[PDB]
């Protein structure tokens, strides 16, 4: 049993990003996720998330 | 049992980022996630998250 | 049982970042996460998070 | 049982960062996380976090 | 049972950082974390955190 000589899993490569000008405003009362950039994940025998917003959980 | 000579898992490579000018404002009353950049994760036999916002949990 | 000669897991490589000017403001009453940059994690037999905001937990 | 000749886990490499000018303001009443940069973690048989904000816990 | 000739776990390498000018202000009434830079952690059979803010815990 073998796995590949060059194996790439959950990978980000070679990202550029420019904001030559920007305005951003957020208002929140009682979830916000913003700007999440160049992100890499691997999960094994368990769940994964990368930008998760839940406003509220009630039980 | 073998795993690959060059194996890459949950990897970020070669990121550039410029803000030549920026304004950002946040207001929050009672979750905000912002600017999360160039992030790498691996998890094994357990869950993962990278930008998680929950406004509130109530039980 | 063998694991790869060059094995990379949960890795950040080669990040550049410039703010040639910036303004940032935050106001919070009763969670905020900002600017999280160039971050690497591995977890084994246990959970992971990297930018987690919970406004409040109540029980 | 063997693990790789060059094995890298939870690693940050080669980060540059410039603020040629910046203003930042924070106001908080009753959690804020900011500027978290170039961070590396590994955890084994136990959980991990890197930028975690909880506004309050009540029980 | 063997572990790799060059093994790197929870490592930061080769960080540069400049603030050619900066202003920062914080106001807090009743948690703030800022500027956390170039940080490396490993934990075994126990939990880990690197920038953790809890506004208050009440029981």
D52 vs E49: CA distance, rounded Å: 8
β-sheet bridge partners, residue C24: B24, D24
Beta-bridged to residue D57, according to DSSP, are: C57, E57
- Would you say D53 and D32 are in contact if contact means Cβ atoms under 8 Å apart? yes
Q: What angle (nearest 5°) sits at the alpha carbon of residue A10, between those of residues A8 and A11?
A: 65
Q: How long, in residues, is chain D?
A: 59
- Could you say which DSSP state residue B37 is in? E
Nearest of D2, A5, D8, E2 to residue B1 by alpha carbon? D2
Q: How far apart are CA C9 and CA E44, in angstroms?
A: 17
Experimental approach was cryo-EM
**What helix, strand, coil percent values describe chain A, rounded to 5?**
0, 60, 40
Triad C14, B7, B5: Cα angle to 5°: 120
Q: How many CB atoms lie within 10 A of CB C54?
A: 23
Q: Which residue has the tokens 């990368």?
A: A50
Interface test with B, best of C1, C31, C47 (most B CBs within 10 A): C31
Tell me the chain D residues in contact with residue C48 when contact means C-beta distances shorter than 8 Å: 43, 47-49
| Nearest chain C alpha carbon to D6 | C6
Cα D30 to Cα A16, B43, C26, E23, E24: the distances in Å are 38, 33, 14, 24, 20
Q: At what resolution in Å was this solved?
A: 3.3
Strands laid side by side in the D32-33 sheet: A32-33, B32-33, C32-33, D32-33, E32-33
- Tell me, yes or no, whether chains E and B touch by having 3 or more C-beta pairs under 8 A: no
- Nearest Cα of chain B lies from the Cα of C5 at a distance, in angstroms, of 5
Strands of chain B (E only): list them: 6-15, 18-19, 23-29, 32-33, 37-44, 52-54, 57-58
On the CB side of C51, CA atoms within 13 Å amount to 41
Q: How far is CA B7 from CA B1, B14, E9, in A?
A: 15, 17, 16
Please name the member of E47, E53, E55 whose beta carbon is closest to the beta carbon of C30. E55
Query: 3-state class of E52 per DSSP?
Result: strand
What is the distance between the alpha carbons of residues D42 and D23, in angstroms, rounded to a whole number? Answer: 33
C53 chain-A contacts, CB cut-off 8 A:
31
Q: Phi/psi at C46 (nearest 5 deg)? A: -165, 150
Cα–Cα distance measured from residue E20 to residue C56, given in angstroms and rounded to the nearest whole number: 37
| C30 contacts D27? CB cut-off 8 A | no
Instruction: List, comma-separated, the residues after which chain A is broken, a break being a C to N distance over 2.5 A; otherwise answer none.
Output: 30
Angle at D22 between CA D16 and CA D26, to 5 degrees: 110
Q: Which residues pair with C32 in a beta bridge?
A: B32, D32
Q: What is the DSSP letter of D21?
A: S
Under 8 Å between Cβ of C41 and E12? no
What is the distance, to the nearest Å, from the Cα of residue A2 to the centroid of all Cα atoms in its chain? Answer: 30
Which residues partner with C28 through β-bridges?
B28, D28
Nearest 10 degrees: Cα torsion E14, A18, B32, C14: -20
Q: What is the DSSP string of C1-59?
A: -B--SEEEEEEEEEE--EESS-EEEEEEE--EE---EEEEEEEESS-B-SSEEES-EE-
Query: Where do the DSSP E strands lie in chain D?
Result: 6-15, 18-19, 23-29, 32-33, 37-44, 52-54, 57-58
Neighbours of chain D (3+ CB pairs under 8 A): B, C, E
B12 phi, psi to nearest 5 deg: -110, 135
């Amino acid at each position: 049993l073998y796995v590949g000589s060059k194996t790439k899993e959950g990978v980000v490569h070679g990202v550029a990003t420019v904001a030559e000008k920007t305005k951003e405003q957020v208002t929140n009362v009682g979830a916000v996720v913003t700007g999440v950039t160049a992100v890499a994940q691997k999960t094994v025998e368990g769940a994964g998330s990368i930008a998760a917003a839940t406003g509220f959980v009630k039980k």
